[model samples]
Every structure is written in structure tokens, then in C-alpha cells.
Target: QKIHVGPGELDDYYGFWSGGHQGEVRVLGVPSMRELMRIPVFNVDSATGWGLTNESRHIMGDSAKFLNGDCHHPHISMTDGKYDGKYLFINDKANSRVARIRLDIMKCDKMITVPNVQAIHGLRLQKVPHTKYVFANAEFIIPHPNDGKVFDLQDENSYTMYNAIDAETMEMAFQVIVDGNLDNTDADYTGRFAAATCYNSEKAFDLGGMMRNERDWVVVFDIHAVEAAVKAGDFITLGDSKTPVLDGRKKDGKDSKFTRYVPVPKNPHGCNTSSDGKYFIAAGKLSPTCSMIAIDKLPDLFAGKLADPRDVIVGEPELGLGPLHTTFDGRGNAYTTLFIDSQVVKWNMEEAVRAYKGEKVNYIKQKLDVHYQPGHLHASLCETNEADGKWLVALSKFSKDRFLPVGPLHPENDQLIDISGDEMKLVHDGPTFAEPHDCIMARRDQIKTKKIWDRNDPFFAPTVEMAKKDGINLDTDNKVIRDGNKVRVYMTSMAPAFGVQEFTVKQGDEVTVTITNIDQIEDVSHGFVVVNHGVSMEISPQQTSSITFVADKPGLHWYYCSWFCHALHMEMVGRMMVEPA
Candidate 1:
């Protein structure tokens, strides 16, 4: 008995937050900040082999190569840089992969590891305004994709590039190797053009501070020009996970002249856009205030004045102590996160222009206290293309004295704020998994958010078709068979039982194992792991998974259902024997 029914999906604003290092994305309803669901991606979630399931293996793509990941930012699909509520995209920092979670099905539609990128922490998976082009900016630029070159302290080199992916197809569309090291990339905003904030010079590879520029900077991309480049094929296509880059890594061919660099106070992490996309806001962590860059006035500086983009002076206004991020409201005001001060400061965004012009007047408006070091603050349109700003979420970087002191490994906080009033109000602090980065939300009325139940079923296989494809006779239920060195096992994993299957193979013989979770009900997923072998897979409800390994050693190795579904879960085991060839 509550606002929404637990039985069916609600038509309300839902927020997706990346469960950093949890290999999952958490869904939450706005206003109340009530957690909804935790969808696993990148890593194998035993809750049902999200990655190991044969149906999801392709969705997990080369997951075995990258066993785990640090889930960073989660971004909703956008139309014309606005939340369209179509799909959600997130990145795995550890694996350098991006996954498109289909809102239509509430499951992952596709996932692809960046061919030669590593440790990506860029803007929210950005969708170009009115386009299907979703851009991925890679962080921690390594000189060589694989050549193992340690960063020299005096190393003035850095590789920065944006990996482009087709939102609909989830394939690598193009790789725009924007020249830079972009060691640090924070919240990015999209509009007519796009804006992003990063630390140091475009090519500096500072391990934090030693190599970074004393002053930080914000970059604005002429998306229209970028689109022109795309149309003209000035953009080079980067390979996907399965395609190897023969040229060491992505080639630094044509330089992108679309980016406009504006130097600001160093150590900043936020790059946000105004509602109309004409003004851009930059938060400088090293400084006490944030800067509002007049983005629309850039073309004049580029063509009219011919002055360097870095020389462009954007007004810097003091907000609070250690401002880290910015978000705009439907009103002409803006909100910034104060990490060191642990508060959110709301100020006049229009007045921020005066400060940019060196005619600074009082711009600060109000401040609201938060749980801890608040990093990314997202209002409704602050992260989207609109500004129906009311509720603001403070993504805290730490929760030290916040919730009963939960030891050194403290849980993070998603402190929801009520911004509908004149003064900022505190709603509630919702605890989140591990650490989280950027998150996007949309009103249910604006766009669509539904599940596929069934692409938007590439492999929606029937039992008969599955049997025929895997060469298993479901009618006879032999569950075991062998042809010379080739062995196959087919069975089901259910509560308290594994529908036991037997297998016998000679030493040096190849073996294959396939499992189908027979349960028709939801959440009744299962997993299988063979002892002493590197064979591990998860099979979800109504899903099947298979793995192969050589029976090189003659021994009796036991295999069991690795997923913990019930009290008698460990009892679900199968026996296997191998003889000396």
C-alpha cells in the first residue's frame, strides 16, 4: 500500500545510478529516491548468470577477458541533447566497455569493450541532440593501447579521444581522437554544441598534479561542425571489441578543430550546459567558485577575433568552498556542489555572466547542507535537455558522519534535495552501492520507458530450436553423449535439484557443457562452475549457457550450481570422470 504498485512498472520518473565496482546499475524513482531495481552488466552476476547466460553472452561480449569493472556514470538516451527516455548507457572503467541497457526490456541490449581504450570516466554516455550518435570519451590516456609504456614524471604526452558508438545498433561508429590526455573528465552537457571539463592541457598526462597544468580548463565542441565532419567522413572509424586496431592504437590523424578550449582554475570536475545550450558552466575544484562560460559567443572569438580558445575569458563567480559540479534550474538560477564544505550552493546563472565579464556583483543565492563531500549534483534538466528543475540529487563522494559510522568501507549517499522552494530543502539521503558518478533522470511524461519482455529478441529461442542448435535431444533427455573426444551435456537447474547429468571423457579429450534454466518464473536463475577448471558460467531464468574445456587430467572433478538460490543450493551438483587416453 504505497504511491505505486509493486506488481507493475510505474509511469513515473525513474533514475539510473551506476553501481560503481558492483558491476550493476541501480534504478530509483524520483521525489522519494526509492530504489527500484539492480540490473547487472559487464560482470557475471550470480543472481542469475547475467553475463554467463548463453542468451546474454553476446550482450556481455568478451566479458571473460575483463572479469570485472568499475561502473562509473549512467546516462539516459537523449533526443536533441534532451532525455528522450529511450535507453540508458553506462561504462565499465576497469574493462573499458560500454553497455546499452534497453529500457524497453529493462535488460542489457548490448555491451562493447572499447578496442584500445582503458579506464574511461567521461561525460554521461552523451546522445547528440536530435541524433542517434552517442559519444564515449575515454580517460587515463595511455600512450600505447598495449605497448606498456610507464608515464615518465616529465612525460608531457597524453592520448585523449572520444569513442563513438551507434546508439541503435550499439556498434562502434567512429572514433574522434581529440588530441588530449583528459586524465580527468567529469559531468558533460549536450545541447546545440557540447561542453566537457577536464584537468590540465589537452596533452598533459599528469598523475594527478605533478604533470597537470597549474590551471584547469573546460572544452566546448562545435557539435554542428563535428556533425559536418562526420558527414564528410573526416571522422575515422574506430574498431569494436572484436576488431583489432592494426596501427598500434587509434591513429592520431586529422586534428579536430571543433573544440574550443577555455582555461580556468585547476582541479575542476563539472561541465554543465544551460537550458538553451547558449551558456556553459564549469566548476573548479581547486577554486572556491565556479565559472560560467558564454558558449554562444565562441564563434566570434574563433573567427572574428582569431584569439586562441584558451584565452577566452569566462566569468568566474564564487559559490562556496571547493565547488565541484553545477546544475541549472528551470529558473534563471544554478546549483553547485561544495565537496569540502559539504553543501549545495544555488546562485543566479544569469548574474554569473556579469562575473564572466569582470563586472562581478553578488551572485550567490542560497546553500543547503548535505551528507558529505557532494560531487555531481543533477537537477532534472541539469543533466538533460530540459530544466523542469525541482528535485536535486547530491551524489556524495563520502558519507563519513552521515549514517551510523559504517566503518572504513562506508556506503555512499544519494541525498535527494527539494529544490521546488525558494531555499534548498533536504529530502532524504538514500544509501547507494559502493561509489557512484554521474546519473540521469527524466519525467515519465516526456519520453517512453518500457521493457521489451521480448532487440527492442535477437535470440528469442524456443526449446525445440535451442535443442536443434545445440545438438541436444530434448525429447529423449539423455543429458549425456559422446562422439570420440567430443562430449556434450544438457540439463536444467532448478530449486533443490540440478537435474543431474553425467559425463565421461578420455584424457586429452575436448568437453562441452550446456545448461538451460528450466524455471519459467522470474528470478529463478542458476550458475555452474566446474571445480579445478576455469569453466564458470551463469544461466538465468529461461536462459541457457555453454562452455568448453579439455579433459587434460584424468580425475574425478565435481561440478555444481554456483548460484545461491536456496538453502539446498549447494546440493545441485553433477559428477564427471575422465580416463587416461
Candidate 2:
């Protein structure tokens, strides 16, 4: 008995079920008729299969078990280090934990648990200097009994939200109870609970909702300050909120307070800031519109009654459904993912400028209908060269299902299908991706500095008096100088991708050298050292620093990036070659 099946099995059948066999899962639409791949999962026999008679018993015993069942529907994934580097963090929602896997080791190192979280829907990772933390939205619910009856509604609004876990220790730091009702009724099983919190600042968090009620608002919580920062800051309310200030009314701070609440359209699920922190984009899951608000002149919006609230920098509409997540490239463009529509959309700020300027603009748009049932997409901008180029990485939550007709002895129809990949490359050539969610890029560079050296030997030599006459200081302040008829040489550091200059002299020649930092960036800094020769020191930006070591070892040496800012420390390196002569 063959029956038409979709991607994943019903929620009730996700776990162990008696009697009825698992149904067949198939990729609904594919460019070619040829099957790309197949995944298999087992179905158990219990009271649930009683409707199918004897056939359910026979086929349930022969079904294959689902591979990679350890984590239930991993929606968000992030690479350990740089782009396609090692390590991956995946959000295992069903298991109520985030799984950490070392790609090179191909093993799970740790599982950070979030206790009492009924469902961990979305996961996001923030990478900062020395500190990193994973933020996720958790939904809590009372477990229903196995009696096969839907659970009745309880107070759904009561639940604890969390910014849990220390990035360093991977331990739960704290949890805050949000002011809202939980949808505990069994009817809203979509499990599309409170998405994830978007971090505006260390103190403020932006939350998303389904927009079911009038109060269905994007709540801004000042955790540290304990205040409702913004209410009624949605697209519909922006006009009224700004009317007082725009019309040049006098006095009263009350009218100015409305500007803080930027109006967001319905179902604003995902919110993120640009890399440069110039713009904040909030997206709606059920609606086709997204809002990009400017923060450059935030104080202006807070001006007294006459301030204008129509300061929205960008607002665009689309035909697609459910813009789930959005990320911007440094070059004025953003990439968004639409879950229901199963597509990726690129919004161009440059084109928006042309439209504002009354000029017709032709924009280059790329649409790839690859991932099936796409969700919670994370994106980052990668620099290809001097020009501004970008790439969008999307993630999908695929389902597996098997279907069969009513029969007593007929074998059950079982098939496994991953809606992701949508007939595209399964493994994507390089790596075998079960459900790839997020990706980031890593870069490398070389630092070079100039130094003055001493010249000495039987053929080229100078004395201490010569060094003093030449304005050369040979003590702690300088490393190179002339002594007698010979010159001594030294090196500060031999960073892997960076190198320091060296001077050659007779076997016993005195040398003096000086090193300095020239970059304008105040935060830019580096260290100088000769690892094999044992000489190392830190160099501040625009500040000259020096270290001296005997030219003992006559071989090639290397140096590397040690600054925390240089993510690819090992890559920012250089080598130095020495001569025995």
C-alpha cells in the first residue's frame, strides 16, 4: 500500500509509538526526477498501530532506525573558529542543550544543558574579544501523559527566559522570567515559541512573538535597568508616536519619549545589528515586510514634542513569506531568509538610495530555492578583496516521514527525507553536512617594520666611539651598534607571517638595531621576539620598542600573531633566514 507523504512524520510519532509503522518521507519538488538520497528511521509497534491491524506488526519490526537521532532537529549551527575551520556548535532543541563538536576530532566534547527548558527553539552565538556566549529562546511546558489525549490549557504566560551560560566556562550564568503568558495548550503544537533574543546591548534584549493578540508586541527588556524600554514601537504606531514631535509642539518630555519605540511590523521574529553597528534590522516571520532603523542620531528622536518619529532609514515589502532571519554585509546590503516560502532574499541599501534619489536602479539579485523548510539563518560578510563582496549562509530543519495504506500483512512504506538541500548537492562536495546552520570567515595578514642596523667586519667595521659619533645607543634602548672593526646583529621577532630585518657580520661582531610601530590605528599593536634565541617583548601602536638577542642559531626561524584581536594568530606570521658566515 503506497500513500503520498511529506517531509517529516507527525509530531505525535516523533518518538516511540506502538503498532503503526513509520510513514514514507519524500522530497516533494525537485528539479530532476532522479532521487538524490534517502534517510531511514524506525517505527515501533504499540497501541497507536491498532488501526492498521496485522500489517503494522509485520512492517514495524523491519524498519531501520534513524541515524543522527542524538539531537532533535538542530536548527542553529556555528563553526568553532573562522570560516569552515574546526569545531561546530549546534542547538539540540529537543534535548534541551547545545552540542559542541570538534570537527577535526569528529566527537562531541561537551553538552551545555539548559534545564527546565521545554523547547529550545533558536540559538545564536556572539564572538567578542576573550568572551563568547550562546543566546537562545527557551519555552517551558508541563509534560503531557502518554494517555493519547491533548493536554488542557494552563497559564501559558508563566515561564523563565535565560541568557544562560558563561562563554568561557560554558556554565549557566543566570535566567530571567519574561512578562508574558505561555501558550501551554496542546493545540498550538507548532512549537514556534518565542524565537530568540536579539542583543542590542549587554543590558537590553529584543524578543519576538506570533502577533496573536493586540498586546502581541516586540518587547524590549532592560535587564540591568529593569524597565520596559519600548512599547507600541511597531510600524503601525510609528506615525502617531512621532506626530507630536514632528508638528513642532512645545515643551513636555512625554511626547519625546515616543521616539524610543521604533514601530516594527507584525511578527518581527529576527533582529540583528550591522557589523559596524550603524543600523538595526528587524524581520517579521508571518509578514513580508522588514524594517531597518537608523541609530546614528538616536538623541534627535528623543527631542521634545516637536521631534519627528518618521526617521525610519529603510522599510521594504516583499512577496515572499516569513522573513525569518537577516544579516548585513558591511557594504550596505542585507540577506534574509523566508521559512514558509523556502527562499533567500537579498535587500540592497544601495538600490534603496537610488529609489530615494528618484533614479531608476537596476539591482542584481540572486535567489536559490535550495534548502527545504529553511529556518533561523545566520549570515556574515567576508571580504574577497579590496572590493565589497558578500555571501549568505542559510540553515534548514528537515523532516523524515514514511507512509503506507491500511493493510493486515502488507509491508510498511518507510522513507527518510531531508527537506534541506532541495534537490541540490547533498554533501556539498567538501564536507558531509547533515543540517548546516551557520558559518563565519577568518582572515590573516603580515606585519612588517623597519629597523636600523650596525655594519661591521674586517672588511666593514666600526668602534664604540664610531657608534657614539653615529648617534647609535647600544644598551637597553638599542640593539644594534658598531664595536671595534665588527658589527653585532639582533632580531626582535620572527612572527609566522611577519618578519624583522637582520644584519650579517663576522662571527664576533657587535650590532645595534631599533624597531618602531608606524600604524595610525591606536588599538593596533604587536609583539617582538626571537623564539629560538629567547627574546620577546610587546610593541604598542605608534610606539617604538626594541629587543636584542645574540645571533647564535644560524638557521631559518618563524614568528606568529599573538594578539587577541588577530583571530587567525597562527596565520599572521613570517620567517627569518640566518647565515653562518
Candidate 3:
């Protein structure tokens, strides 16, 4: 009954929550539900200087044109159907991008904007064998050329793509054009199949037209077939992008070799796989049912053995008013968040199949009312095969009267429930800022974090390479190198002092400041900030951070350590003298 994890006690699990609309990933300790850290992906973070740094800007590339992002689906990579704690992938729906966060340092190392797609929504990683590919679903249906050439919404060219990216290289492997608008996605344990729920099957531009269909679909993609098609050069390239694109649209009562369209109820939202690798559940957003497709039967459908795509549906459990998302308990049970009803329904999976077979068995276990408008519910280790089923979190969309009035803009409610027992119990109510669409939990032992960074880390290796060309040692040297109008200032930060007390550059020259934190102790991070200039970056222990800006002001400017590390931290200042050109 006591959910309190004391001051000195550590939590059992590490929870990763998607910062919807905020464009970041929040790390919170489970059970306690305490905020641990925030990893900036598509968003600009001032504390860590994620966007301002030269290294991060290089990773962002042209996608940095827009600063805002809508991040969703924080999924950690897996190996052998378990969390390997290697990399966590998140999707930026606002900009059609996917970012990879390295778990060891808890930083976004690489990001790629999906070409020829708009509004990347559902994202998931491969579970079987290892995380070879990161699967992403673009939600909005737009014109293929999208250069004002084709404006008709009814045209066959207006469609969205399902992208598969290399997990390690962070490169776009291929894109498959689907028939309808994709919403959420999930992958099978065999690593051969990945599926996504579709909403706008009619390719409608208006809201009413989008929901005209009585039954939409869940598009299932065969990874092996797609790879083979690409290998055989059976794909086409879009516009200026070189990424291979394939057509997976359904046509003439025949399914594409790369994809299969299995009809579910109207406007399905979340596509989630069971922990035991049994079923891929598609929650009926408008309809009151949740369609469960048997995973073992997928191969038969793909192999041309099954006649109807609907034959793969082993169970269509009628749960509640609006079943949005479903999470597993690993004990043959599922917890579904009902949006319209504002409740969480716990039901049995095996009994649901029996009920679907016309048996008079009640699969409904219990229905517990949450705060209001719950969107996604996640259980402990629900994504992996080792689902422990200890705790469950319900992300409620509206937290109206659940907490104290915080003005017109109220925080969303993330209610923590104890799911280790037979009955579901409400333990704590956590009010989160803005919105958090979904979250995932991994075991404490699963994630191994580094206290300090390695010097030769690839994250900052490019800066080191630049230092070599400038003929300066970044570890000990405190000197400035000038190449035409470019100025390179290499310095080392040790606690309360910067190695370079002052550096001079011309007013119109481009200035690149590279600082390496020489502090060997952990948590002794140093930050450099130039006065009156929008330049700042965090240099962690043994980590090198670089920032570039033009020395526009022809006067004396002061720079100091932004992160307080010692009693003389305020004295850790330097002068940036910009001579008049």
C-alpha cells in the first residue's frame, strides 16, 4: 500500500516518457515517479546546449530550420525480444523526423528527417534477434510531389509512407507507401512483420470525410519481402531524395508483396503487440472493440495460404466506449485505456478469443475509472518479452479537477497504478506539463549509464579532428588559431578556471570556441556563456563541446562559467576581445 520510495532508496524501473509537443524525452524513476532527466532531441535545450552546439547542429542538419517539434513514441531498442538498453528512438511528428538517443550517455546522438513524408507519428523498434531497423509511420496523407503540382486530395498520388531506418547507421533504408493515413505502429517478435493503424482511408481533407469508412485497416508489412524488393532494385526514388520507395497500396482485390491490409473497425489508433508474442492488438478508436491478430498466423497470410486478410483476426473483443491503446500484463491479461469513457478496462486475452468464438464467457475482468480522457496506458516491461507486470501508468489527456488549479492551461495527469495484484489500485496522481502521449519502462539493471564521457567518443570526435588541423592539443593547450577570417579558440576548463583567460578576434571574423572539461570527477560539468551573445554550451567531465558564432561586436565582451562548480565559480571568467576591422 505504501508507494513511497524513500529519499535514499532507488527506484526499481526507469521510465521513458515522450514529451508530446515539447519535443523531448523525459526520464523518470518508476514506483516513485520522480523526474530524473530530460533528453533534448528535436527541441533546443539551453541547459545542455543541444541545439546551439556545432556537433548537435551537424546531427540536426537542415532540419534545424524549424526549432519546434511534436515528439511521440519513445521506444528503446531490443535484443532477443528484451531491452538491450543500447539506443532509444523517438519520432518528431511535427517535422517528420526520427532521433536516436544513446542510453550510455543519455544524449541524442543522431537524427534524420524522413524524406518525402509528413508528420511522422507512430514509431517502434525491431524486437526479434536485435534492433536492426527503426520503423516509423507518417500520419498525414499528402501529394507525392508536394511541390504545388498535384493539389487534388482524391488523386492516387496523395498518400503517406511507412519508413524503415537503419538502427545503427541512422540512415533511411526504405519507404513504403500505404493506402490510408497511419496513426500508431508496433512490431512482431519474429522481426519479420510490423503493422500500423490507419484512420483516413478515404484520403479526405475534411474531418467528416476522414471517418466515412465503417471499417478502416491495419497495414502489416513484411520486412523480408520489402528488403528483397529493394535488393532486387524493384523500388523507385522520390523527387530529389535517393531513399528507395516502394508501393504497398492495396489494389484490385490483391495485396502487395510488401504489405497486407487487414480490415479492423473504424479509425483504429494504437497497434500494440502482446508480451508473450501472441497477438498484435489494434484498439478501435471509434468502435468499441479491440481487434487481436494472431502473430503465428501472419506467416500463413503472407505466404498466400490464407484467403481473407480478416482470417488473421483470432479475437475482436468488445471492451468499452473508446478503446484507444492496450498494454499487456504478461499474465494473459491486457489493460486498455478508454478515451471517451475516461477509464481503464482490464480484460483477459484467452477468454476474449473464446468469446469471439461465440462462447458465453465474460472476458471483462474490471473497469477502473481514471481522472479524465486517458490516451495511452503502459505497464512495466510491457514492450519486451520479460514483462514483469509490476506497475501501470495511465496518461490522461485532461486533468481538470484532478489537481490544484494552475490557470487556464492545466497539466495532464499521469496516474500510477499498482498492477502486481489481482485488482487494479490507484496509487499516485502525477500532473505532467504540457502533454505526454506515451511512455515505456525498462528494468533498472537493463540500463547502464556512464558517470563520465570517454575522450575519444564519436559524439565529439569531429571537433577533435578540427583541433588536429588547427595544430592545437585540446587537452592541455589554450591557444587561438586564425585562418583568414576564421578564428579557432581551443581551451580546457578545470573547475573554477578556463585554460584560456582571453582570446582576440576581428569583428567580422567567424569564431569557433572549443572547450574540453579536464575535470575527471563526475558531475563536475562546466558551461561557457558569452556576455550579450547567444552562445552557450555544456562541457561534461572529459567531454568536448564546441560552438560557433560571428564576432560582430567590436568591443570587450566577458564570458564566464554558467554552471557553478566551485566557490570561485563566479571568478571563472574570460574576456573575448573583438578588434575593429
Candidate 4:
């Protein structure tokens, strides 16, 4: 364990790291770069006994458009639509699905299948500019195959918009269209307006999706137009906006016109907005500069004490080779990643440079080199939201011979930079365990890394504290009962895991097995698996989980624990005798 939860002096910075190939989201602490927790969405994690436990194994194989997946763009839930730092939402590029995680509990509370799109490159909910609605865009200019439909390829997906997910209900809401095809539907900028960047019709983007900028552009939205369509309930289109049966429905709530387009410099990526919700920034990946869009100029918003982009973008000068992403420090400064140059460009968010004693300077302030080829960049949230700009991280795709030669395909690489200096300074280099995509961090206090679950929580129990609850006793509960066409098996996992020793059932029986983890110790976790029945899962101490399946085959099969809890981890076994019906 290279990480330890330290004392009060050092602040614990939590960042949700997107597990690209692993199909999960990992909670990591900054400065230390230590992994804190793992929130599984699309993939089944055996080490933690996540998907295998009879408790949650139900949704383990839940997929139609995705099996396991490519998880990316983890957006924390918004406080009135902007980063509230409480919950987190991430996308499954492979399955075209979305999931919400309750950060307080470090558990994925809900997940939903997208209605009308392939992968939602990046989805986020915003309160700034608009009221409160979660949104996402379509990635990969693919054909319109709506479960049971198709469309002409040419213009089918060309003019598309973002699909909406109601923040309150945690459900897919509507399709918010923005008029044009894109390269990479990655990265989002929120505040007075909503914006997303594309590389192809697009350019390059987060997740190492595709190349970017010849025709790369950033799409804008008057979010007010969004709540408008749902309110007005008129300008909504259905049945895919293609041909005869083209069934992709869209809402035309462009209070000022569907949505506007901002032609960015070179290939634009990472659409991040100013901490004050004023300017929308982008990186000119192919071009040697980055661009900023004016949120005040957006359809119908007022520019309060914030800096204007229209009043400055044409002035953002060339800083280096490939400029990919930018994040803000509350003090009106922006930091970007230089891919080819293996550096970070720290520049001022060019305002009418006010001379605050000794603060006014050139727009392109300084450049600091990192480890290798970098992609997206982010700053710690306490700093971003407060305009502190304390630390900037560079996610490098090229780690090369950075660590012990692992293989052709290696782990992720990153460099921590101190942005609180006259010039950006290199601080720490961290090599992650997974191929991560986009990453976001926040002050430990601004975010809740872990909160104890109440008795009401599904997985809150460490063991059966109230053994007498639900007609469940210590030894008596370990038995199998034939109720109608179904059989219920009650088992308990302890140091002597074969708590039940054996249970009997009939062939062709609908089997439902529940395991009560009796380990009273707080974190003592037990896992269960009906081996031959294709089952496994983690049962936390004091908690109980169940799995249901068909006893199609007659056999004397034994079930065991999936997590290596005690020495009897391999000896934690019980029997499932499927007698001939």
C-alpha cells in the first residue's frame, strides 16, 4: 500500500479517474496520487467481490449495447448544476450507457441505458446559465439504428444534438440537438451556457478517441432553450430525424437558434469554462494555440463581473505544438497541455489585464514541460472554483520506458505541476495502474470521499448484527426451502465459510440464494459464488446479498467466496445439490 489516510494538516484531494479499458471509475487522492476506492459501473471487479456477490450480481451482466465497457468523462453531480462535489456521473463508450455514483457512499447508485445514440463521449449536468438538467452528446458519426431502425449515412448523424438526462429523476430526459456533425463529442464547458467540442466534422478529444482539427469545431447551446422545449412542449421532433421511419427525436429549443457554432483554432478539445462561469476555453491540438469563447455573447445571458471571450480570443497567441486542454484557476488564469512539446502552457485568461498591484502581465504567461506526450489536463477543484490554480496535472499518453518495462501496452502516466508560482513548476510524477482518460480533482472537504452507510443502505451491514431480524438466526438460517417452483438457500460466510455446509434443491428449480456476512468487524468483507452456476459476489460484513438463477442442471455443486478474506478463502464452500425433479 503506497497510500495512507494522513492526519489533518494535509488536505486529501480526491479525483475520479476514468478507467478506459477497465470499464470502471477509481477514486484517487491527489498530491499522493494514491487510489482511494473503486466504483464499478460497466465492469465486474473480482478482487473486491463486486459483481459476483449475490447482492449486486444481478446487474453484472446487464447489457444490450454494452458488455463490460470503456468508461470515461466522470462528471461529479452539480450543486444547482455546477460541480457540487457530491455525486459523480460517467459514460460507457462501449455500451452507450450512463451511471450515477453517490460519492457520500462511494457506490454507483444508478445506471441507465441511453435511448438514441451510440457512446456519449462526455455527459455533464449544469446549473449555471441554465437551471438544472444533465446532458450528453453523441460520439462517432454512426448510422441511426434505433434498436430496430436505420437511416441513410450521409446526413443521418450530421445534424445531431445532446441527449438529456433529468437530474432529479436520474432518467434519460430528451434529445437536445445542436446542428452539425463532429469529430470527437468529448469534453463539456458549462456556466452561463453549455458547450461541447468536436475534432472531426471533428478533431481529437478525451479518451484518445480520434484525431482532431482541420474541420474541428466547438458547439454551443443556449441551455435556456433546453428547459424551454420541455416547458413549451412543442418544438420537439421524434421518429429518428432521417427518413420514412427515421426515429431520432429532437427538441428545437434554441431560444436564439438551435445552437451556435464557434470555429476554433486548429483542432479544439477540452471545452472547459472559466471558474466564474464567464469564458469557455479550448485547446487548438493541431494549431500552436488555444481559443476562448464568450459565454455572455451566448443567446440570452448577462455578463456579470466576468471576463469576456469575444473581447479576447483573437488575441490568444501560439504557445507550442499540440495544445489539448485547459482548466481555470479562480484568479482569471488558464492552464493548458502542450502534447508534442511535452509541456503545459500556463497563461492568463486574457482580460482587460487589470493592474492589481503586481498581478497584470502578458496573456501567454509561461510554459512548463511534463513527462511525455500529454492529452487532457485538469486543476484541483478547490483551486479551480476558488480561482486558486494551485496544482495542474498533465495526463500523458506516452509513458514509454518510464517504469519497470511492463509490456507493449502499459499503465497511465501523469505529472503534477505547481501552478502557484511565478512560472509553472514541475512537482511530482505519478504512474497510474490503468489507462485513464479524463481526470478531475477537488478539495477533500469540497467533496465527500466516504460516508458511513445507515442500516437502510443495501450494503451497509458488516455482519448480521440483528441475527433475529427477517427470521434469520445464526445456524438455523442456513437451510434450503422449496417454496412453490422456487428454492431459497440461506447461507452465511464466516471464517469457517462452509457455514451451511450443504443445501439441497431440485433440478430445473428457480434458485434464490442469500448470504449473510456475519463478520462483525467493520471492513471484514466476504464474497460468495455458486461456482458451476456462474455466480460470484461480495457480501460486506454484517450485510446480506442474494442471487437468483435457474437450476437447469442436476448436480452436486459447491459454492465459495470470491474475495480473499480469511485463510479459508479457498475453503469457503457450500453445496448446491440439484436433485432430479
Best by TM-score: 3
* Superposed Cα deviation of residue 262, candidate 1 (Å): 1.7
- Tell me the deviation in Å of residue 448 in model 1: 6.8
CA lDDT of each candidate? Answer: 0.67, 0.37, 0.92, 0.63
When 1 and 4 are scored with lDDT, the better candidate is 1
Assess candidate 3 and give its TM-score to the true structure: 0.99
lDDT of 1 by residue, 1-581 (tens): 02333545563567778888877888878755777777878767655456554566656755755567787777777766676766788887887888888775567768877776766666454544443656566766655434557554224333556665778887876554444434333323443455566664535444565235666566566655666666775543333344211111123532246665666776667766666565667788877877666755776754546455554555678777888877878788888899989999988876777766677477788888888889887887565557876778889977777788766788888887777778777767778767877676777675454321221144435434656866765423547667777877767667667776467778988776776666666666677888887677766665556667788888898988877777888787877888876
Off by over 4 Å in 2: 1-88, 102-106, 140-157, 180-211, 214-263, 293-319, 340-342, 350-581
lDDT of 2 by residue, 1-581 (tens): 11233456221111111111122111111111122212121212121111121222222222212212223222112232122333344444444555443323222334455654455544444322212444555544332221335343233322334333444455654443443322110000011111232222111122433344322223222221211221222211111122100111112533322213444555466655555444455666656755555544443544333244445445444527877666555565566677777766665755654554566764335454534555544332221111123223355544322123333332221112221221211222111123333333222111111232212211112233344565754232224446673453323332222333444444333323333334445455566545565445444343333333455566666644445435555566545455665
Let me know the TM-score candidate 2 reaches against the reference structure: 0.41
Candidate RMSDs in order: 5.3, 23.0, 1.1, 6.0
Give candidate 3 misplaced runs (Cα > 4 Å). none
lDDT of 1: 0.67
Q: Model 3 Cα displacement at 438 (Å)? A: 0.5
Per-model TM-score on C-alpha atoms: 0.79, 0.41, 0.99, 0.81
In model 1, which regions exceed 4 Å deviation? 1-12, 31-34, 54-57, 125-128, 144-158, 178-180, 183-192, 202-214, 227-256, 301-314, 355-361, 444-456, 459-483, 491-542, 547-581
Task: Tell me, by lDDT, which candidate is best.
Answer: 3
Q: After superposition, how far is residue 426 of candidate 3 from its true place, in Å?
A: 0.8
